[PDB]
Design a protein around this nucleic acid. Structure first.
Lengths: 195, 50, 195
DNA sequence: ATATATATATATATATATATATATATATATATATATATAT
DNA sequence: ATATATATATATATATATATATATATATATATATATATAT
């Protein structure tokens, strides 16, 4: 009766939906294929009221909702998308990563060199507020569990052979970090008071 | 008088010949939500004067 | 201008995707929306290498893996499906449930949904195969563990106050006689393995 | 002594039900015009 | 034979009833993390 959708477009769209975000440095072929068929991809996704956001400066593609503009659900909710509200420590680590990513993008370029930090560097930042949990093993366990949870959130990579993670570009793509800024101001105020 | 976050408690003090034995409970809310589950519970049972 | 699909179509397809099946008896509006543009649903699932299953005798709509130019190989490897693959014990209990469903159907017909059996009714039907754990609570735990998953696949409702469950019509297609014969052949292969 | 599984707590997001407000449709009331029957 | 009086019909207006849409409350399901018990 009528033609099918092209195989590679289907495969790449499904891949991105499975992963949410992807990198040209990771899968450049799918990256180029999607960017050569953005109309087809969005047409595939708009029935879901979904779409894709891209960052060629940092070489990242990612999904994005495409519902009707600004309904009463400004704190939006979508059928196919179950939303999350992270805890004190999760968002604390996210703010730490945000600040150091901001610093890196100035001292090492806006994703020109993938943002990196060592475990022994993140741990002191957490220790500023949480203090020593009791042992170095406990510190590493805490930070590694949090980093794994964020990796499941697509925010960070696992530490390298030198215990250095890579910050995914998606961190730059958060919606309203003003809450992160207020939280970090509150945290620094609290530690300054509680010392 | 107590619609918001609140805490409530009760404790009766039975005894015999000086032997205290106390049956007490504690019920509290976290928010204006008034579900049966919203009321978090804990009973007590002790025979120590402290 | 834009290829935006009609909002009602998006609603119905999003719900169907969210739960993977749609019964007219429960949500007639979305079911009739789907059957009003079933080719739209097909052409939207086709990008995802998925297809729409239809059974109007039971007023049911469900999603099924499509055949790509490769018939999905082992279709359970399809990227989008969130769940695991079916296993032996699940198939055993599915067969028993389908036996009761066909009995109830001969009793009252196919399109209705009033069929039920109790926890104690199920317990011997599987206990014959699975041996005796040693306590009634343990076999109840076994049955409830199976039922939780099978509900996760949409086959059955949750255990009710009467310790019963309601058979969902979709089981008519998971227990397809053609698929039952194929599973019988696979069981003969398992015998060869035992050999 | 360690690892794994389970249960519980936090908790949040979604779905369903119910009540109220608004819009629309129908009906009844009133008034005027026309037809017709009766009287001169 | 014509005039007039009265009954009947119609059109419009407004009042009311009913249907539907939306807002809000409640209940449950997921869901994920952590603590504890038990098995090896």
């Amino acid at each position: 009766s009528e033609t099918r959708t092209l195989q590679k477009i289907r495969e790449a769209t499904q891949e991105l939906l499975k992963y949410g975000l992807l990198e040209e440095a990771s899968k450049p072929n799918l990256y180029r294929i999607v960017l050569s068929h953005p109309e087809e991809v969005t047409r595939i996704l708009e029935p879901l009221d979904l779409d894709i956001g891209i960052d060629e400066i940092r070489g990242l593609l990612y999904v994005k909702v495409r519902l009707d503009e600004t309904p009463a659900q400004d704190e939006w909710a979508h059928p196919l998308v179950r939303r999350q509200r992270l805890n004190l420590e999760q968002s604390l680590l996210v703010a730490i990563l945000r600040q150091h990513f901001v610093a890196w993008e100035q001292e090492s370029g806006t994703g020109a060199s993938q943002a990196q930090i060592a475990i022994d560097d993140l741990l002191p930042q957490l220790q500023i507020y949480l203090g020593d949990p009791g042992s170095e093993s406990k510190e590493r366990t805490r930070l590694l569990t949090l980093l794994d949870q964020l990796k499941g959130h697509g925010l960070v990579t696992s530490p390298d052979a030198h215990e250095r993670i890579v910050i995914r570009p998606i961190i730059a793509h958060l919606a309203d970090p003003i809450n992160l800024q207020a939280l970090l101001a509150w945290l620094r105020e609290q530690i300054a008071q509680q010392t | 008088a107590r619609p918001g976050k609140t805490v409530t408690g009760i404790a009766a003090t039975l005894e015999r010949e000086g032997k205290q034995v106390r049956l007490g409970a504690l019920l509290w809310f976290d928010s204006t939500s008034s579900s049966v589950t919203d009321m978090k519970r804990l009973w007590l049972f002790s025979d120590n004067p402290g």
